[PDB]
Write an enzyme that holds these catalytic residues in place. Sequence first.
Site, PDB file in Angstrom:
ATOM      1  N   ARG A  19      36.296  33.650  40.752  1.00 15.87           N
ATOM      2  CA  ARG A  19      35.197  33.372  41.678  1.00 15.87           C
ATOM      3  C   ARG A  19      34.473  34.646  42.134  1.00 15.87           C
ATOM      4  O   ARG A  19      33.276  34.580  42.430  1.00 15.87           O
ATOM      5  CB  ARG A  19      35.722  32.583  42.889  1.00 15.87           C
ATOM      6  CG  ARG A  19      34.683  31.695  43.566  1.00 15.87           C
ATOM      7  CD  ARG A  19      35.255  31.008  44.795  1.00 15.87           C
ATOM      8  NE  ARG A  19      36.113  29.870  44.449  1.00 15.87           N
ATOM      9  CZ  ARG A  19      36.807  29.153  45.328  1.00 15.87           C
ATOM     10  NH1 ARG A  19      36.761  29.448  46.621  1.00 15.87           N
ATOM     11  NH2 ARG A  19      37.556  28.136  44.919  1.00 15.87           N
ATOM     12  N   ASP A  69      36.903  49.841  45.380  1.00 13.32           N
ATOM     13  CA  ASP A  69      37.093  48.432  45.726  1.00 13.32           C
ATOM     14  C   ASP A  69      38.515  48.000  45.368  1.00 13.32           C
ATOM     15  O   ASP A  69      38.743  46.947  44.859  1.00 13.32           O
ATOM     16  CB  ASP A  69      36.016  47.531  45.134  1.00 13.32           C
ATOM     17  CG  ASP A  69      35.917  46.145  45.811  1.00 13.32           C
ATOM     18  OD1 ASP A  69      36.318  45.985  46.947  1.00 13.32           O
ATOM     19  OD2 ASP A  69      35.417  45.265  45.144  1.00 13.32           O
TER      20      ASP A  69
END
Length: 327
Positions: free
Chosen positions: A45, A154
């Site tokens: 997702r 990240d």
Amino acid sequence: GPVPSRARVYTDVNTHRPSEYWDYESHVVEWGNQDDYQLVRKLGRGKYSEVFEAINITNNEKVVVKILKPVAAAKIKREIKILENLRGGPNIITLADIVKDPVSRTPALVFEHVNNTDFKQLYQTLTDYDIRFYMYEILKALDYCHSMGIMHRDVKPHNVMIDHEHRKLRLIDWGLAEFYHPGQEYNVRVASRYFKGPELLVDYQMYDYSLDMWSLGCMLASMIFRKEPFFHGHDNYDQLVRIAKVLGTEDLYDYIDKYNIELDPRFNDILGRHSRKRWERFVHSENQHLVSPEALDFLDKLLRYDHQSRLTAREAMEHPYFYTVVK
Ligand SMILES: CCc1ccccc1-c1ccc(CNCCc2nc3ccccc3[nH]2)cc1C
């Protein structure tokens, strides 16, 4: 003005490289054939990407296809350059192809297949040994990319894929990664809220690879203490408050004083005053099986306000927490 900062390792890597290595804007994208892939099932997702299990019809092999939404699609050349630069490195996801859908004009990145173990099962059932083993595998990937002059920016569990059956780990989603150039002021709107280092939260732009080590400490704290995320900020200002409620405000101020950092007016009254907490305070009957003096010592050396004082990936691999890991 803020006192400048530079990394204590790998500072010169990008100056000794030809401009084509780091000048991603100049890179020319060779597009593959989108007709080579047939989409089987979805398992991702992300944020500005959709991830599918596909079959490359030219070799009948399973692949992973990452379809990029417009935000991620805008910085494709940077993600492509970084992926191509790191290709073949330890535990780095392998880019196999770059394709474009003629119908929607949306690009996609094709990668080697990873047979992922359910992320909730991993969080809930990995043992103390497994946490040390996989933390070591993550450090291999970070020391490699830092050594190649790139910061991931990240680092979080969503960007680490694990095939637990084959004890295989990959560091993924290099969409936010950047080339480290000493003296460069970077955008602090990187990483994901819970994993943002104090340097980002206080708007200190001259950060480096060490940001990844803070994020790695956030993952470790969450795993061994059974608190997901560890620092649960409601927004970016509150994020710093959550951090200060554990690490204390004294050290926070010492950090901002060392770099002559001007804090945002609205922090002073919200940061208040907090004492530095002992790591032993987060230890309970339901997490004691994951905690050790070595784990707390290691965590303590990652979760430091001063980005220059955190262990580097290479130093972290020498830590006693990993002595048990089969090498
Ligand atoms: C506390 C996290 C942690 C701490 C210490 C050691 C290991 C972990 C850790 C890291 C990663 C994972 C699994 N992450 C899967 C995320 C993921 N699946 C995808 C499938 C498709 C597309 C994108 C995907 N993205 C689990 C653990 C426990």
